[PDB]
C-alpha cells in the first residue's frame, strides 16, 4: 500500500484519541451503578448491554492511527480476561490512565524509557503488596462463600463448586452441563484437559462464549504435521459416514490444504476441529499416548510407519464431549478402557519411582495427574429450562471466579485493593526523576477504577478516593450500598489474580505505547 | 466497519428524536376519533390505516442513532401486544412520555439511576392499584358481555366465546376456523398446545397475522438436536411423496444445514416448520411422549438407538391442522388413538397419585390437563364468504380480549384506568428527591393515553384529564359519545392485563434509555 | 440597528456561558494560591498587575449575549470592589455559583422570583450572622496581616501599609506615590485634607483614578462664591503672569455665571481646579483660615472687603502638589510657614480648650487635627518602573482594604465566615419551596469560594469544606499552612465589610441574572 507514517507526538495524540474512545465507551459500564451501552445490529433491534467486553469488541475507529491505538489496548486487555477470567474493563480503564499521563510527561520532554522503567517498578512492588493484602481461599467454607458471592449470593452454586472441587481437587478439571431435570448432578468421569486451543478461530461452534463443543466426537491422534488433506480424506469420509464430529490432535496442522479445507470447506458438511498435541519433543509423543489410551484410540506415527492414508475408524478414539477454546482442550468422557487407563497410570507411576531427576519426576506426575484425575461434571438442574439455562451460566461464572480465588486468594473489590496498595507506595523512588514521575503516573492510575465506579454512582470520586485512601486494610467504599466499610466483610472482593493481571497487562501496553516513536499504516 | 460513537446528552437528543417520530406517527390512530395514516406501497396503491401496529412496523429512520431509539421502543412495546394481545400503541405513547420528561431531568443534572428507581417504584404501586381497580370477569354472563363488547357489540360472538370457554374451560385451548355454511359450529377435538414458537420467522405462512397454518401436517418428533439435513433427507423425501406439510418438533434445530435448507431451500417445494420440544431435562422427553401418543407418532431418541436415517412415515404423527406463532404451537386434531391417549392420561394420573412432592404433582397434572383437555374448535358460519371472513376476524379478536379479561379482570378503558391509579399515587415518595421526580415523571406519563385520545377528539385534553382525575372510581370520559360517566357501565373497558403490560414494558425501555450513556453504530 | 432578542433559557444560557468564562479566569486567580496575572495588550506592551478584576476587565466575550452577561457581573463586581476595596473576585465567584444554580432552577421551571426572594432572604440572614461573627480589627500586627492578604503574600506592602498606618494613624489618610527609587520612602507630608468633592468630573485629571493631582498648585481661597469673570479677572491677570496650575477654593461657585464664562470663554489651558470650602458657617470660615495658614496663602472675604481682583498671586498660596478625589480634596503639602502652621495649630488648640461647649471643642479639635495630622505619602520603589507601577497598584489596593478592614473589624478569611454562616442559614426556610431552594442555592454559593481556594491548593475542597463546616466557632482552612487552625489565630482575616459587600452584590447580580428572562443584542 503507499503508507502513511507518523512520528513522535503526532503519533502520540493519535493513539491517545483511539484509546479514549475505546476506554470511555467501555468504562461507562463499570460498577454496580454502571450505565448501559447500545450496540447497533443490522440483524434486527439494537443490543442494550453493560458487558464491557461486548462493547470493546465493537470498537473500531475510522482514522487508521487512532484505530491502531484502540486495537492495541483491546488486544492486551483481553489477555487479562483470558488469564484470570475477568479484568478486561479494569485493564482498559488503567491503560487509559497510565497512557494519558504518561504521554503528557513524554510531551513535557521526559525520557520515555525512564518513564516506563518507573511505571514498571511501581507495578512490581504493587503486585507484591496485593499478594500481601490477599485473603486466602482454600477451605471448603471459603470456596463456597466465594462461589455464592460470584453466583449473586446463591448458596446452591457455592455448594456445587465446593462439592465439585472437593470431589476432584481445587486444581482439578470441572465442567458444567445442562441438567436432566430439577436436581443438580455431579459425577467424576474419565477425562483430561491440556493447554492447547483451537488452531483456527473459525472453528467456534454454537457456544457464543468463544468455545467449541463436540458431542461424541472422533479423536484423531497423529504426531505428524498435517498440511495437506490428501492423506487424510479416507478418515474424513469414514467419520462423515458416522455423522459424528471430529477432533484432530496432531503435531500441528498447516494452513496449506488441511486447515484450509477443514475450515473454508467444512462450514456445514462436517464438524471438524483441530488442535496441537501437548508439549514438545519426546513428551509430545508420550502425552499423545496418554490421550490415546484415555480415548481408546491409537496414534499414527510415521516413525512406526503409520500411514494416515490407512487410518481406519477403529484407530480414532471417542469421547462423550470435547470443549476447545482459545488456549485449552478438555476431553470430557473418554471411551477408553478403564483397565488400560489404570495400566498406564500405573506404568507412569512406576517411571516416577525410578526417575533420576526432579524435572523427570515433575513432568511424569503431571501426566498421571491428568489421567488419574478425571473430570468432574456438574449438571445444573432447575424447575424450568429457562431457570436451568440461567443458573448454568451463573455456575460457569462462579466456577472461573472461585478457581482464580483458590489460586491467589481474594482482595477487596470495588477498585479498593488497587487504591490501597497505591497509598502504601507513596515513598517509592527510582534511578532518577523521570523514573520517579513514571512511578507517580502508575500510582495515580491505580485510582482510576474506583473513581470511575464512584462516578457512575453520581458521587464525588475525589472525595471517596481521598477517604478510602485515608483508611487502612480492606476498608473501602461499597458502591452497591453506597456506604464505607470493610470490603471483605461486606462480601465485595475480586480474585487477586484478576486485579493483578489487569494491572500488569494495562502497564504493558501503556509502556509499549509510551515508548513508540513511529506508526505505519496504509493510506 | 469504523463506528460512530455518541455519549450522554448527544445520544440523548438522538434517541428522543427517533422515539418522537415513531410515537407521533402511531399515536394519531389512538381512540374512537383516531386519524388515518397512509403507508406507501410499491406493490400498488398506498394503504390507509388506523392500526397503530401496522404503522410502527413501517417506521425506520435515516439517522442511525435516531433509528436506534425508534427500534428500541418498537421492540419492547411489541412485547405488550404479544403478552396481552394488545397494548403496543399505548406502550409507545407512555414510553414517549416517560422518556421525554426523564431525559429532561437527566439533562437537568438529576441522577439517571435514581430517576429510574423512582419510575420503577411508581409502576410497582400503580400495578397494585390497577389490580385493586379491576372488575373480575369469570361468570359466563361476564365472559359474554366482554366478548360482545370486543366483537363490536355482537351478541353472537360473545355467546360463541362463552360457549367455547364453558365447553373447554376458561384457560382451555380454543381455535377459530372458517365455517362450512351459515350456522356456527363448535366441537372439542383431540389436540394440544405448548409455549414454543417457530424457530425461524421465515416460516410464516399465508396467515398475515404472523402465524403459520399447516393442513394435515406430518409431525416429526425427535429429541435430538438437528443441525444437519443429511440424516433427515429420507424422511423429507417420504413426506414430499405424500405432498403433506411437515412439523418438526425436536430438541432444537441448528441453523447450520437443517434450518438453513428447511428455510432457504424449502421456499415452495415443501411446507416445513420447526419448533423446539416443550420443557427441558427429563420433562422434555416425557412431554414429547404425550405429543407422540396424541398425534399417534413415535419419538426418535438416540438413547434408544433410534436413527432419523431410518425414520419412516409411520413414525411421523399427523393432525388435521397445526398453528404455530411467535411463542406457541397448537396441535388442533391429533390422529392419535383415543384409547392410547386415554391410556396415557390414566398412566400420568396414576403417577400424580404416587407423587412425592408438590413440584412433581404440579407438572404432572399440567401434562394431563393438556392431553385430557382437548381443543375447542369454533367454526364461524355466515350468509356470505365475506361476512364469514369478517365475523371470523371479530371472533379471533374477541377471543384475545376475553381470555385476557378472565385472567386479570377488566378495567375502565379510554386511558381512564391509568389516569385513575395515578391520581391515587400523589403522595408516593422514594429514597430521595431524584427518585421523587422519577415517580412524578411516571405519574404524569400515565395521563398521556387519555390526553391523546381527547386530542384526536378535537377537545381540550388538560380539561378532560383534570375532570376525570377529580372524579373517583371508574368515572371517566367516553370519547365515543364524548360524555363523562362510569366507564364500566358505558361498556368502555380494557383487560387489566393489557393496561398492565403496556405500562410495564413502557417503563422498561424508558428506564433503559434513561440510563444509557453511550451509543455505537456503523458510520 | 436591528436587535436580536432571545427569551427564556436561550437568553439565560448565553448569559450563563458568558458568566462562567469570566468567572473561571477570576476564580483561579483569586486566592493567594492562585498565581498573579499579566494581561496582554494589542495596544502595546502587556500590562502587569495582580487583580482578579483586571482579568475580568480584560476579558470580553465575542458573543454579544455572553459578553453582555459577562459585563453584568463585572459591573456589579466592580461596585462591590469599590466599596469593599476587596472581594471583587469573591463577588464574581459567588455570583457565578448562584447564577448557575438559579439557572438550573429556571431549567427546573420553578418560579425564579421565589428563588430570588429566597436568595435575598438567605443573604440577609447570612449578613446578620456575619456581622455577629465579625470581630474588631486587630492591632498593627494584624493590620500587616490584613495588608499581606491584599498583598497576596506581598510582605513589603503589608509592612509598608502598617508602617504608614502607624505613623499617620489609622484614621489619618495615607497617600501612595511612585517611589523615587527602588527603596521605598515614607515621608509624612505637612498639609491638611478636607473632604470636598470636585465640582465637575471635567476637572478630573488625566489619571484613570480620576483623582486630580496638580503640580505646585496655586491655592486661592475665597469665602465668597465666585459669581462672575469680572471679579475673577484681576485674579486671572496676575495668574497670567503665573501659569503655575491653579486650584480654587470657594464656598461654592455658581455654576452658570462662572462656569459658562469659564468654559466657553476660557480655554482653561492652564490647569484649574475648584473645590468647595470645607465646613459651613463660621466653622467653614475657620477651616478656610486653617487652610489658608497651611497654604501660606491668604483668604479674601467680602466681610474683609478684600477683593479677589485686588488679591494678587501672592495672596494665593501654593502647594507642592494637590490631589483631589470626588469624596475628598487634599493638599499633600502646602508650603505654608512652619512657624505659621504651628502657631495656628496652637491658637486653634487654645480655642478648643477655651470653648466650654463640646460642639465648639469638636470643631476646633477637628480643625487642629487636620493640620496636625498632615498627610502621609508612601513611595514604592521597584526594580523596574513597570514593577513599581504594579507594586504601587497593589499597595493602593491593600491600603484601602486595610483601612476598610480595620474599621469594619476582621472576620475569618478563606470564606470561613461564608461557609460558617451558611450552615446556620440552612436551617432557615423560605416561605415556599421555590424560595427554599433559592435559599439553599445561596448557601451553596457561599460554600463554593472556599472550595475554589482549596482547588487551587489542589486539595479536594469537599473534604476541606466538610471539615470546615464541621468545626464550630471560627474554623477554616489556611491555604498557606495547609493546616487546620483558627482563622483568627492564623491571623488571616477577610474584612467583614468586604465579605458582606461582595456577597450582597453577587446575590443581587445572581438574582437579576436569574430574573432576566430575555436578552437583547444588536445584530
Ligand atoms: N493563607 C490563606 N488561607 C486562606 N485563605 C486565604 C489565605 N490568604 C488569603 N486568603 C483568602 O483569599 C481571598 C483573597 O484573595 P483575593 O484578594 O484574590 O480575592 P478577592 O479579593 O475576591 O479578589 P480581588 O482581590 O481580585 O478582588 C480571601 O478570601 C482571603 O481570606
Ligand atoms: Mg482581594
From Swiss-Prot, chains A, B, C:
Inhibition and activation profile: During the substrate-folding cycle, the two GroEL rings separate for effective substrate binding and chaperonin activity. Ring separation is triggered by ATP binding to the trans ring of the asymmetric GroEL:GroES complex and avoids formation of functionally impaired symmetric GroEL:GroES2 complexes. Activity of the GroEL-GroES chaperonin complex requires Mg-ATP. UMPylation of the chaperone by SelO/YdiU negatively regulates its activity, and may facilitate survival under stress conditions.
EC code: 5.6.1.7
GO biological process: chaperone cofactor-dependent protein refolding; protein folding; protein refolding; response to heat; response to radiation; virion assembly
Modified sites of kind N6-succinyllysine: 33, 50, 116, 276, 320, 389
UniProt keyword annotations, A-Z: Acetylation, ATP-binding, Chaperone, Cytoplasm, Isomerase, Nucleotide-binding
CDD domains on file: GroEL
Major location (coarse): cytoplasm
Reactions catalysed: ATP + H2O + a folded polypeptide = ADP + phosphate + an unfolded polypeptide
UniProt xrefs under PROSITE patterns: CHAPERONINS_CPN60
Gene Ontology molecular-function annotations: ATP binding; ATP hydrolysis activity; ATP-dependent protein folding chaperone; identical protein binding; isomerase activity; magnesium ion binding; unfolded protein binding
Effect after changing residue 1 to S: Complex stability is significantly decreased.tuberculosis
Effect of residue 108 to C: Forms inter-ring disulfide bonds. Prevents ring separation and leads to the formation of high amounts of symmetric GroEL:GroES2 complexes
InterPro entries: Chaperonin_Cpn60_CS, Cpn60/GroEL, Cpn60/GroEL/TCP-1, GroEL-like_apical_dom_sf, GROEL-like_equatorial_sf, TCP-1-like_intermed_sf
Binding site for ATP: 29-32, 50, 86-90, 414, 478-480, 494
Subcellular location: Cytoplasm
Record note on modification: Phosphorylated reversibly during heat shock.
GO cellular component: cytosol; GroEL-GroES complex; membrane
NCBIfam families tied to this protein: GroEL (TIGR02348), PRK00013.1 (NF000592), PRK12849.1 (NF009487), PRK12850.1 (NF009488), PRK12851.1 (NF009489)
Subunit organization: Forms a cylinder of 14 subunits composed of two heptameric rings stacked back-to-back. Interacts with the co-chaperonin GroES. Can form asymmetrical complexes, composed of one GroEL and one GroES, and symmetrical complexes, formed between one GroEL and two GroES oligomers. The asymmetrical complex is the functional unit. It was suggested that the symmetric heterooligomer may represent a transient intermediate in the chaperonin protein folding cycle.
Record HAMAP family: CH60
PANTHER family per UniProt: 60 KDA HEAT SHOCK PROTEIN, MITOCHONDRIAL
Domain comment quoted from the record: Each subunit is composed of an apical domain that binds non-folded proteins and GroES, an intermediate domain and an equatorial domain that binds ATP and is involved in inter-ring interactions. Forms a large central channel that appears to traverse the entire length of the cylinder with no obstruction. The central channel of GroEL functions as two cavities, one in each ring, that are separated from each other by the crystallographically disordered 23-amino-acid C-terminal segments of the seven subunits. The entry and exit of polypeptide seem to be restricted to the apical end of each ring. Modulating the volume of the GroEL central cavity affects folding speed in accordance with confinement theory. Small proteins fold more rapidly as the size of the cage is gradually reduced to a point where restriction in space slows folding dramatically. For larger proteins, either expanding or reducing cage volume decelerate folding. A stepwise reduction in cage size results in a gradual loss of cell viability.
Family: Belongs to the chaperonin (HSP60) family.
Role noted for this protein: Together with its co-chaperonin GroES, plays an essential role in assisting protein folding. The GroEL-GroES system forms a nano-cage that allows encapsulation of the non-native substrate proteins and provides a physical environment optimized to promote and accelerate protein folding, probably by preventing aggregation and by entropically destabilizing folding intermediates.
Protein name: Chaperonin GroEL
Gene assigned in the entry: groEL
